[PDB]
Amino acid sequence: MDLPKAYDPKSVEPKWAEKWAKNPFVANPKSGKPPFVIFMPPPNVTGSLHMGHALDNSLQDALIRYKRMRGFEAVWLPGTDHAGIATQVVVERLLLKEGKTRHDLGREKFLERVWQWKEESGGTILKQLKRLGASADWSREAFTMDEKRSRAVRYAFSRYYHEGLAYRAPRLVNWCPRCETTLSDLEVETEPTPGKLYTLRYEVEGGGFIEIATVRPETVFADQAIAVHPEDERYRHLLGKRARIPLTEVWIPILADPAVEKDFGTGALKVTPAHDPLDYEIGERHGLKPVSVINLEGRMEGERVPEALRGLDRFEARRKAVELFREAGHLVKEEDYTIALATCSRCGTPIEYAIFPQWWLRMRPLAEEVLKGLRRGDIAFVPERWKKVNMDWLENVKDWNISRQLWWGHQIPAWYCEDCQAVNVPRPERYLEDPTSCEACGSPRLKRDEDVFDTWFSSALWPLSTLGWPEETEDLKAFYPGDVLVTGYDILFLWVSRMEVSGYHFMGERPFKTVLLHGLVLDEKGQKMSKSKGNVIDPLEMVERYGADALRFALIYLATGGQDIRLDLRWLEMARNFANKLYNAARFVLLSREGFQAKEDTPTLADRFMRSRLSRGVEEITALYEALDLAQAAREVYELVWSEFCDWYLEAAKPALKAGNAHTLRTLEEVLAVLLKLLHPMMPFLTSELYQALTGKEELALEAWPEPGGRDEEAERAFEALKQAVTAVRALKAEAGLPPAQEVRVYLEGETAPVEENLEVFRFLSRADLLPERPAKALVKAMPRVTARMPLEGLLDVEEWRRRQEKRLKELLALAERSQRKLASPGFREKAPKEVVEAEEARLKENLEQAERIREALSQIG
RNA sequence: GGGCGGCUAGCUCAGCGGAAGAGCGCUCGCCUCACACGCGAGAGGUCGUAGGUUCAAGUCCUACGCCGCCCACCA
Ligand SMILES: CC(C)[C@H](N)C(=O)NS(=O)(=O)NC[C@H]1O[C@@H](n2cnc3c(N)ncnc32)[C@H](O)[C@@H]1O
Numbered sequence: 001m002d003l004p005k006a007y008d009p010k011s012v013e014p015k016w017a018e019k020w021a022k023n024p025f026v027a028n029p030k031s032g033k034p035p036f037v038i039f040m041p042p043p044n045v046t047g048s049l050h051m052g053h054a055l056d057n058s059l060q061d062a063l064i065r066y067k068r069m070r071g072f073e074a075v076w077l078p079g080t081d082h083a084g085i086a087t088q089v090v091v092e093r094l095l096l097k098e099g100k101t102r103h104d105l106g107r108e109k110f111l112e113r114v115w116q117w118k119e120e121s122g123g124t125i126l127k128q129l130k131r132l133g134a135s136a137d138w139s140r141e142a143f144t145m146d147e148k149r150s151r152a153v154r155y156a157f158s159r160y161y162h163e164g165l166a167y168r169a170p171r172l173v174n175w176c177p178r179c180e181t182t183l184s185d186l187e188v189e190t191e192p193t194p195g196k197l198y199t200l201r202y203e204v205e206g207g208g209f210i211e212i213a214t215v216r217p218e219t220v221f222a223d224q225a226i227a228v229h230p231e232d233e234r235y236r237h238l239l240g241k242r243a244r245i246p247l248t249e250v251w252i253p254i255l256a257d258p259a260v261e262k263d264f265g266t267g268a269l270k271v272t273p274a275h276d277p278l279d280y281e282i283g284e285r286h287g288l289k290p291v292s293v294i295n296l297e298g299r300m301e302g303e304r305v306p307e308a309l310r311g312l313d314r315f316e317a318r319r320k321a322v323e324l325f326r327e328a329g330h331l332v333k334e335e336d337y338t339i340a341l342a343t344c345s346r347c348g349t350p351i352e353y354a355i356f357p358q359w360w361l362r363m364r365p366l367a368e369e370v371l372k373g374l375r376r377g378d379i380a381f382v383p384e385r386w387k388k389v390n391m392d393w394l395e396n397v398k399d400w401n402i403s404r405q406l407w408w409g410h411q412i413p414a415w416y417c418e419d420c421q422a423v424n425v426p427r428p429e430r431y432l433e434d435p436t437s438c439e440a441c442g443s444p445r446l447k448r449d450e451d452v453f454d455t456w457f458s459s460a461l462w463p464l465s466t467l468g469w470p471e472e473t474e475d476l477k478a479f480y481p482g483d484v485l486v487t488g489y490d491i492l493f494l495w496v497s498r499m500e501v502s503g504y505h506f507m508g509e510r511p512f513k514t515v516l517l518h519g520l521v522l523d524e525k526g527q528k529m530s531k532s533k534g535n536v537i538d539p540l541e542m543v544e545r546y547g548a549d550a551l552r553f554a555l556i557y558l559a560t561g562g563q564d565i566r567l568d569l570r571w572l573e574m575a576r577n578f579a580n581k582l583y584n585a586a587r588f589v590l591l592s593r594e595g596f597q598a599k600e601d602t603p604t605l606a607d608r609f610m611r612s613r614l615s616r617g618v619e620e621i622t623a624l625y626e627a628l629d630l631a632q633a634a635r636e637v638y639e640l641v642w643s644e645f646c647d648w649y650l651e652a653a654k655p656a657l658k659a660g661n662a663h664t665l666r667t668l669e670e671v672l673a674v675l676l677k678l679l680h681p682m683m684p685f686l687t688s689e690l691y692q693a694l695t696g697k698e699e700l701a702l703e704a705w706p707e708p709g710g711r712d713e714e715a716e717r718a719f720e721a722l723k724q725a726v727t728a729v730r731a732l733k734a735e736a737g738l739p740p741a742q743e744v745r746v747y748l749e750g751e752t753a754p755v756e757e758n759l760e761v762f763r764f765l766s767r768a769d770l771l772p773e774r775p776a777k778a779l780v781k782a783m784p785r786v787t788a789r790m791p792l793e794g795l796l797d798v799e800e801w802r803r804r805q806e807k808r809l810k811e812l813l814a815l816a817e818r819s820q821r822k823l824a825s826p827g828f829r830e831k832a833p834k835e836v837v838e839a840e841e842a843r844l845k846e847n848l849e850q851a852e853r854i855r856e857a858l859s860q861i862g
Numbered sequence: 863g864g865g866c867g868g869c870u871a872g873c874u875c876a877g878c879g880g881a882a883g884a885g886c887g888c889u890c891g892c893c894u895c896a897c898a899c900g901c902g903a904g905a906g907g908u909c910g911u912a913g914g915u916u917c918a919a920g921u922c923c924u925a926c927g928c929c930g931c932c933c934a935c936c937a
């Protein structure tokens with residue numbers, strides 16, 4: 001230890017960080033010690049980490065460390081997700097376009113430049129986690145697209161397909177013409193946008209009118225029906241007729257369908273299964289063949305589509321589409337409208353729809369496999385308000401498009417016969433094998449589905465791929481049911497649920513026993529932090545500024561009840577300052593046991609007191625940990641250390657140490673040890689350094705959690721008396737306007753036994769000597785247990801003392817009032833605890849006793 | 863159209879059945895021999911509104927007001 005005046009994290013954290021880095025706390029399946037597993041949500045290989053991750057891992061670590069030094073096999077599996085679509089963009093964008101030109105460099109040369117990036121990003125994400133003191137079993141650092149993990153999927157899929165649950169069909173997909181790939185519902189965002197609702201109307205079989213309000217004119221040629229509410233007979237007895245469609249000679253049928261909102265626009269809507277979910281939905285509800293007018297390039301084309309219209313853009317198609325309607329006489333009511341435009345969450349551009357042959361996943365059945373457990377009580381949720389939010393998500397899911405046209409992910413394992421047009425999917429038992437001859441036409445000429453899987457598909461496969469489950473390992477046998485899953489609600493659906501499935505399905509069990517959802521950190525402005533919003537702060541920028549233990553402590557302190565966390569540097573200071581205080585407290589004890597000269601070894605009230613108040617702490621804090629409530633423990637320990645050890649104990653011991661009392665210096669050393677234990681999970685670095693310098697022990701991390709020892713009742717009530725006498729005098733001087741150091745003689749009344757026995761402390765702390773004889777005239781301070789009378793010797797600020805005391809009375813009588821009322825209240829005396837009542841009765845007894853004391857003094861004073 | 867979270871001291875946030883709390887800021891004193899990233903003494907809240915349940919309600923029930931999320935197929 002170097003013991004300067006102030007603590008410099010930079011002289012400490014980096015070394016310990018490296019020590020822990022190069023020598024991970026490797027997990028042992030055969031440890032024969034109860035395990036504790038936590039799967040680290042693998043950060044996306046997109047850039048660096050941000051304060052969000054920090055809160056996420058910092059929370060995890062503190063759990064690992066606690067359990068570890070609590071006696072378990074702390075297994076925390078680290079890893080990083082390739083992100084798929086995400087990373088894709090990142091490289092494609094910035095790096096490439098900016099770098100020079102994304103301009104297709106081949107499906108190969110591109111995959112190169114991506115891994116290169118995967119290295120930088122993946123490398124950085126690790127430094128960061130290391131430097132934040134992540135005690136992660138880096139010996140098992142898994143990467144979604146590493147050999148061992150790629151197998152977990154290629155197998156998982158195969159076992160799905162041949163199980164039926166994974167099919168291939170034309171169900172329509174949300175397609176982004178920017179990234180040229182399909183997305184999932186959860187991957188597409190819909191954000192209101194100013195548009196133009198057009199009401200078009202057209203001919204009818206025999207008669208003549210039908211009016212329709214559509215946001216997209218182009219999708220008319222692809223119409224297949226006019227939908228009309230089933231009960232809106234209203235302006236609807238043209239139900240069952242036909243309808244030339246604007247510009248065409250095509251005759252669509254007017255049908256009824258429950259999804260028609262009679263009150264929106266004209267009580268009837270156009271129908272286009274080939275270009276929209278609602279329509280496609282109703283379309284198949286009455287069986288109507290799909291029909292495209294616009295392709296994947298987002299350009300017009302097709303049967304119906306009119307000449308001269310087929311060609312250019314999808315939007316520059318509606319421009320002329322409208323004109324060719326009004327100026328042709330089919331347009332009627334054009335008007336503004338706030339449309340719920342759907343866009344690509346990761347590129348912006350608005351999606352589109354299309355029927356395409358894709359890989360889907362019968363969620364309906366799976367979801368039930370899971371709900372089976374949840375219902376039984378298999379999994380526990382921290383806020384607990386998420387159980388329902390989870391269960392309800394499953395309660396109504398839709399088959400998920402697993403395939404993707406990205407160049408990143410796992411190239412799905414399906415082979416298509418260039419002769420029989422049949423799919424060949426490796427069987428589970430030989431899953432690793434590549435079919436070579438179509439098991440249909442028996443032909444050799446095969447072709448593999450060059451699609452790719454959904455990043456979320458591999459990720460949902462984690463509490464298994466990290467434990468080598470593509471196989472049947474011992475790690476997996478030793479500790480599969482993770483004990484606590486830590487993550488922020490932002491991915492409760494596309495991450496947690498997904499896993500709960502692949503988990504409850506590929507093992508008859510829960511991937512984890514408890515899901516701990518924490519809030520999100522967000523820029524001071526209140527909005528979520530993410531590379532997306534462009535509002536991210538590198539956690540290291542903060543470590544460098546306040547220090548890693550600080551950052552860790554703030555973040556945990558604030559992660560109360562799954563609530564979010566608004567960025568507020570003030571809290572970082574709060575933390576740094578607390579590090580420094582803890583540090584100083586140690587510096588004191590080290591510099592004290594310096595050249596100490598033992599003159600005696602006598603138990604002191606202060607000693608007995610801190611040992612007791614410590615047992616209290618140890619109990620309380622453990623329980624808070626045993627409730628995953630770190631945020632609270634974080635402040636319960638702040639309290640203990642700062643208000644009970646530094647503010648009172650250390651100071652109370654200063655004298656005894658000058659007097660060469662070994663029993664005290666001993667206690668200081670022993671108590672400080674435990675505190676360094678308690679604080680370790682949150683602040684590992686500083687807390688280790690100190691413990692080393694204090695006990696010579698090299699790895700606090702491996703030490704055992706403290707056990708609550710004593711609990712001296714009287715001793716605590718005794719020392720309290722002292723605190724009061726001390727603070728009484730302190731206040732008296734304050735009010736009197738006397739400087740701190742000013743020597744003073746005062747007189748005590750009441751539970752004074754404590755002050756008398758431990759006189760030197762009282763003297764040292766108050767800077768006052770005791771008076772044998774109660775002074776005639778004097779300034780008075782009334783405490784709950786003791787009363788102080790300060791002789792009128794000297795120049796004193798009586799006005800202040802007066803004011804201050806005139807005000808205590810105002811309050812003391814006010815309390816007496818409340819008490820009186822309660823005691824004399826109906827139902828309180830009777831229907832209320834035989835304790836909370838006799839106490840309220842005692843509060844009154846002494847609220848008066850004090851009021852009188854002041855009153856009398858207050859008047860007595862000239 | 864559904865659910866959910868928030869609404870407590872000037873600021874940022876805890877507390878959720880029995881006498882209103884913390885950090886910072888502020889007022890007054892202190893370079894008191896671990897710490898000025900500090901020490902001591904204070905000021906400052908009818909806990910968003912309206913109702914109830916309860917002997918007892920920031921703390922539970924019920925509407926509502928704003929703020930923000932999530933899930934939704936009003937074309
Ligand atoms: C399979 C998933 C783990 C996926 N690879 C993924 O979520 N990758 S990530 O980079 O977004 N890391 C997300 C994890 O970090 C948490 N997180 C991300 N942003 C924040 C934030 N602003 N506040 C609090 N927590 C946040 C997520 O809860 C998740 O555990």
Ligand SMILES: [Zn+2]
Nearest residue numbers: 176179344347
């Ligand atoms: Zn896109």
Ligand SMILES: [Zn+2]
Nearest residue numbers: 417420438441
């Ligand atoms: Zn074949």
